[PDB]
């Protein structure tokens, strides 16, 4: 039973309502209270901030917010939560041995590929399609012209020969008999083979339009190096990653960009990424990887940076420091942290992550199916047209 | 302050970059002290009416000992001022739209 | 491991639903349409012709006489060209060697009960280490089996793995990762693609109550952060 | 080698590290070959007419 | 089965587009046709394997260098060449 | 093939690679420097030699020297395009 | 002042590719070639049957 604020929106009456908490950190806290004989009562942070040194308006005084403000002021005695270990936090409070090793990473939109009906006709431009369609008939009729006017193959026969040479079907039982017609028809066969090979060479790529916009390399991407108005990426305001970007010597240029887009909580940033308001969200490896596993439309980027661990922070002068650290280590040695990871982090719903080429499905290739259906519906009228022609 | 007035103010900005990193490493290795200041006299350095302006103009007229920047080693400039060994290779080159 | 290729690797270019619609749903409808157009040459011969057009190997077929049937055959052959192009485009990648790890993890039945195998599993670690203490504390029976295959050092374990006298080497994650990186031919790999069980860290030991501990921790965190 | 480190830090860009539709110009050689076929077919047709006469 | 028809058949097998051909009746001629068709499979595979890369867009620079005739004498062009630098 | 790799100046190695068809460079030039006409520390020609080198650089003299001594090619065979099949690569099928 | 700007680099053997007569038969191993050759005849004769 954790007593936490009800309305997290700013400028709202925040009354401490008793809700209920459960998960990885609560299970770890229960284990700690079991091994070490002590009683606990959980209560959420006053605000949604993890903790960062901020200069208060009056007297320009350094102050801790969120968890650090709650703990260093005596309101709380222990922090069982994903609290990253770093200098600014370790100078004032003391962390136990990490109960979860993780790093910073980037969560972005999955960007499932968009497939259109004309995907099969994409490799050739409309002008090329018209040119080849005209060329087929030109070759057929001039083959007829040179065969009928030979010194020594009806129009349907010549047209069928040209069409069946173009697309391999065998609809042509008749071959040219005049020498000029034979030469033209066979070089036309070579031309049709060349066209088919050229169209086939890149057909698969145009069927599934995969793009490199998704799967950003990471912070090492020069897109991340140089911020742009079109590409907006952010993180959680007043958190460990914010401190890491503030203090880093060289990433200040993009820290300035991120300072004006920081989000209040990780859930809000994840939601903003989900509906494409945020292009990229920088956050802990554990949370982002769990969200990527749970959410099919979100994916991580890789090359974990700022490798650190979550620590159960306590006050500098505390009696539980050694015992909590030893209990964390002992739980690490046996299969307890593994059990917690399996039951809370290591369950998967949708992954769809593999280096193998994508498998064709209905969406990626349906223009060809609708083309066959259009052939059906066109033949359904062409049979009546041919019957009417035979009537005359 | 404005084009109407003929005087201004020395605004203390922060200079950093490739040439600044070179200058900082030079300061650590040679053990000297530096006072950077941007030049508004000339565009980049040129002899007009037998008068040198810009970075070279400031150096030749003893207004500054050093000229750290994107300054190209030339024939006339080397005749007027003394250059150091080149640290990056440059030259006149053509950039066109692909 | 030498690895294996699943028998379904050649069926990977299209999903099962796509195969079904292509060959039992769309093909049957196309055969019905071809026969109807020709009759306006049994249904079996139309099916045979259409299937032969699917993968044109110059199989003997009897072309329909009607013009509309010929048009339908032509558009179907265009579809078959599409199908062949899409199937052959990525067949090389799908028919490729797949490496499967011998053991899923330390909880695998091979480690826990190695006796129920015709070839006994050969695994062990160097003595006088943290890994031996951890395995002894967690799995007594596995430790009693594994101390028989006890190695002498990192290099001895690596050469035993290369020759074949040892199949698995249980050791520190960082050292094993470095050895896998340094190894030529990529013959030795860590199972689970970097799977770590005890997930501890390297620390600088100090005397109890040492005054240097706080400053060393702060400096190490500074190195991590910077 | 500090110079090299500074160059990578300050001067590296986008295009330094670095499927399209086919136009008429992209595949103009094949159509040139087809045109040569038309010309050769006409020439050999005229030659056969001359031989017959 | 004249020599022209044999050439036509073998050529058609080179790139099999189901062109109308008259197969030889002899068994040994059929064996030779089969080995040639295997050769044609080899040829088609090897030619189509890298056709995508060879048929690819090639970017040619407008000017070879500063000594190019475009820079030296830009007037002899219907579109005048537009080039310049910053002053000073 | 007594030596697998030879580390040397870009100019000499590139010239040899251009001249010799069986030798090829590797890329990513490192330790970027220049060839200098070294003289004694107390010399009278230092400024004049440096100025003459610079003047030859500005006009087209170093370019002429590069063209006439370094920038002539015999065999290159350097392209990112896939290799073109020739007699040797595909001849087993001919013998078949 | 430098009269030629250059850098360090590595010269190695060109290593022209080696092509053998059996290069066309390489993609399938000898056992696979024998298996497919046997399969062709097996299918043909029992099609006749
Ligand atoms: C025209 C009629 C005969 C139907 C067409 C045949 C295919 C649809 C069937 C026949 C055999 C079937 C295969 C036979 C057995 C394999 C293995 C089978 O189990 C495995 O994957 C083993 C994996 C391993 O051992 O590592 C999975 C199906 C699969 C691919 C089958 C896939 C479907 C197959 C090809
Ligand atoms: C009488 C006419 C309509 C011909 C009938 C053809 C069917 C008997 C064959 C052709 C294709 C076969 C399919 C081709 C491949 C698919 C995918 C395949 O799913 C897989 O991913 C491979 C198997 C595996 O992964 O275990 C399962 C069979 C199946 C449905 C096959 C089922 C049987 C099929 C439909
Ligand atoms: C026997 C005599 C009458 C020659 C007949 C040749 C024809 C078969 C035509 C048909 C299409 C013609 C081609 C269509 C257009 C192209 C583009 C053309 O390239 C351009 O001029 C710019 C691109 C563009 O045309 O839009 C070059 C000719 C060429 C290959 C043409 C060449 C001549 C072609 C092949
Ligand atoms: C821009 C676009 N967006 C699309 N979204 C979708 C989806 C998924 C529902 N399709 N689709 C498109 O197809 C287009 N392109 S189109 O409007 O120029 C166009 C229309 C129709 C055809 C025929 C071609 C022959 C077979 C039958 C359809 C071809 C091209
Ligand atoms: C190891 C080796 N080295 C080679 N050097 C050369 C070259 C350039 C002169 N060829 N060559 C080889 O061919 C082999 N491999 S082989 O001895 O097992 C072998 C022999 C013969 C054939 C037949 C196959 C059907 C067509 C006719 C030849 C096939 C395989
Ligand atoms: C890969 C599966 C091939 C299945 C081929 C079935 C062919 C049926 C022909 C029926 C003719 C009457
Ligand atoms: C008598 C039949 C002669 C056939 C000649 C065909 C020539 C085809 C040339 C194709 C060049 C790409």
Numbering used by the authors:
A (entry chain A): 435 to 586, 601 to 840
B (entry chain B): 442 to 539
C (entry chain D): 540 to 579, 599 to 784
D (entry chain B): 785 to 802, 808 to 842
E (entry chain B): 599 to 686
F (entry chain C): 724 to 819
G (entry chain C): 531 to 579
What does the paper say about this structure?
Canonical N-methyl-d-aspartate receptors (NMDARs) are glutamate-gated glycine-dependent ion channels abundant in the central nervous system. Their activation results in excitatory currents that underlie synaptic plasticity, cognitive integration, and memory formation. Each heterodimer consists of an obligatory GluN1 subunit plus a homologous GluN2 or GluN3 subunit, such that functional receptors comprise two GluN1 and two GluN2/3 subunits. By comparison with previously determined structures and together with our results from kinetic modeling of fully liganded receptors, we propose that the gating reaction of GluN1/GluN2A NMDARs involves at a minimum these three conformations, referred to here as: primed (closed-pore, all M3 helices straight), engaged (closed-pore, only GluN2 M3 helices bent), and open (open-pore, all four M3 helices bent).
Our study shows how increasing the tension of the GluN2A M3-D2 linker by deleting M653 (ΔMEM mutant), in combination with addition of lipids and a PAM to better mimic interactions between extracellular regions of the TMD and the lipid bilayer, conspires to fully stabilize glutamate- and glycine-bound GluN1/GluN2A receptors in an open conformation characterized by four bent M3 helices and proximity of the LBD layer to the TMD. We, therefore, used the nanodisc structure to describe the architecture of the open state. In contrast, in our open structure, all four M3 helices are bent by 19° to 25°, and the larger pore diameter at T3 (5.1 Å) is consistent with ion permeation. Notably, in the open-state conformation, the LBD layer is closer to the TMD and all four M3 helices of the two GluN1 and the two GluN2A subunits bend at the N5 position in the SYTANLAAF motif. In our open structure in lipid nanodiscs, we resolved several lipid or lipid-like densities near the outer leaflet of the membrane that are consistent with CHS molecules. Two of these densities are located between the M1 and M4 helices of each GluN2A subunit. A third density represents a molecule that is packed between each of the GluN1 M1 and GluN2A M4 helices, where it forms extensive interactions with GluN2A Y821. The location of these CHS molecules is consistent with mutagenesis and MD simulations of GluN2B-containing receptors (51), in which the four residues with the most notable effect on neurosteroid modulation were at positions equivalent to those in close proximity to the CHS molecules in our GluN2A-containing structure (W558, D815, Y822, and M823). Together, these observations suggest that CHS molecules may function in concert to stabilize the open conformation of the receptor.
